[PDB]
């Protein structure tokens, strides 16, 4: 739970994405919610202005505003405000979801993908199984920390990371589980950087290695932070007076959900 100095705007996006084994993009789906937390009653009679970049009338996003929000004012002036012009938001510091969106992209379209993935498999001499290379490239601006790759086998023999061909080679097996499978953590994927995670693992046949899933999370606190799809705040403002600015912080985040290769 982030700390709130009066107004805290959380822009949270969840990315689903799917690839073939060779890295060909099958599909993606991005979901978003803008959350508002207010804890000082003076600030609760407020209006948010969205960044000049964002197109609120772009229908591919299916922008839906909370029922109490003035839908028309959102569409004309990119203003989060209330129907009842004299009502206020709660000052109770509870997370109020006021705007949502969802966008999808088709096969071979990378516009919603923060982390592209490719896999290669050839058989191994060191175990009854396969030498795997997972190649990845972030197009994010920040670093990802503690990315987890899960391979849905529970082997008998422990997994051997290839420390030579893995980019971020303190990479380690964190667990091996009968239902959840085998999870490898790598500590960093740096901004706009291609890497690779090489290892060897015991499996009865190639198809048992799939689906491979990845798990990751980016968070950034900053007034000028932009979400992965370009959601951002321009200002916050007294509902009754649009020149009178108000103090506020923004968190933007991006976490994966169904993010996989098979």
């Amino acid at each position: 739970v982030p700390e709130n100095n009066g107004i805290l705007i959380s822009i949270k996006e969840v990315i689903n994405a799917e690839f073939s084994r060779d890295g060909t993009i099958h599909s993606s789906e991005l979901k978003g919610v803008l959350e508002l937390r207010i804890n000082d009653h003076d600030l609760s009679h407020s209006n948010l202005k969205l960044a000049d970049s964002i197109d609120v009338r772009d229908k591919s996003f299916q922008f839906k505003t909370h029922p109490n929000i003035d839908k028309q004012s959102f569409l004309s002036t990119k203003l989060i405000s209330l129907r009842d012009k004299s009502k206020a938001f709660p000052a109770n510091d509870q997370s109020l979801g006021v705007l949502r969106w969802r966008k999808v992209a088709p096969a071979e379209d990378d516009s919603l993908i923060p982390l592209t993935l490719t896999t290669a498999v050839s058989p191994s001499e060191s175990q009854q199984g396969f030498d795997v290379i997972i190649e990845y490239e972030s197009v994010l601006e920040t670093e990802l920390a503690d990315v987890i790759f899960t391979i849905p086998v529970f082997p008998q023999e422990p997994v051997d990371i290839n420390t030579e061909s893995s980019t971020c080679s303190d990479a380690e097996v964190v667990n091996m589980d009968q239902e959840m499978g085998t999870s490898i953590k790598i500590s960093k994927i740096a901004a706009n950087d291609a890497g690779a995670l090489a290892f060897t693992i015991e499996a009865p046949y190639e198809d048992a290695l799939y689906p491979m899933t990845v798990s990751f999370q980016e968070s950034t606190r900053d007034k000028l932070a932009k979400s992965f799809t370009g959601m951002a705040i321009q200002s916050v403002v007294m509902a009754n007076d649009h020149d009178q600015e108000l103090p506020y912080d923004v968190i933007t985040s991006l976490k994966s959900d169904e993010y996989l290769v098979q």
């Binding site: 909370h66 029922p67 109490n68 938001f89 709660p90 509870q94 109020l96 979801g97």
Partner: peptide, 5 residues
């Protein structure tokens, strides 16, 4: 869905 207020 949406939180009432």
């Amino acid at each position: 869905k949406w939180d009432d207020f």
